[PDB]
């Protein structure tokens, strides 16, 4: 039963994670890591791309960030104006 009609997933690197392997991912502080579609992952490990290379980076050095894309949507209504505190 799917509920989340829309789907998003963009995280930014908080610190530089230099790696000397292929399996892992190498990126610097700020390099946004696009969350790629994966079947199953581990409790703490993440899977995505940071431009051209793909690897597994820790979810303890990255933070979530709004998506660079914007999907049109109804114009929410502004605060009517509550009288009673």
Curated annotation (Swiss-Prot):
Transmembrane segments: none
Sequence ranges assigned to domain SH3 in this UniProt record: 8-67
Tissue-wise expression: Detected in brain, stomach and kidney.
Compartments where located: Cytoplasm
Family: Belongs to the TRAFAC class myosin-kinesin ATPase superfamily. Myosin family.
Listed name of the protein: Unconventional myosin-XVB
Source organism of the structure: Homo sapiens
Biological classification of the source: Eukaryota, Metazoa, Chordata, Craniata, Vertebrata
């Amino acid at each position: 039963g799917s509920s989340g009609s829309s789907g998003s997933g963009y995280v930014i690197a908080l610190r530089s994670y230099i790696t000397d392997n292929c399996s892992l991912l190498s990126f610097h502080r700020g390099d946004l890591i696009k969350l790629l579609p994966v079947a199953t992952l581990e409790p703490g490990w993440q899977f995505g791309s940071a431009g051209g290379r793909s690897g597994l980076f820790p979810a303890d050095i990255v933070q979530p960030a709004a998506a660079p894309d914007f999907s049109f949507s109804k114009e929410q209504r502004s605060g009517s104006g509550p009288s009673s505190g």
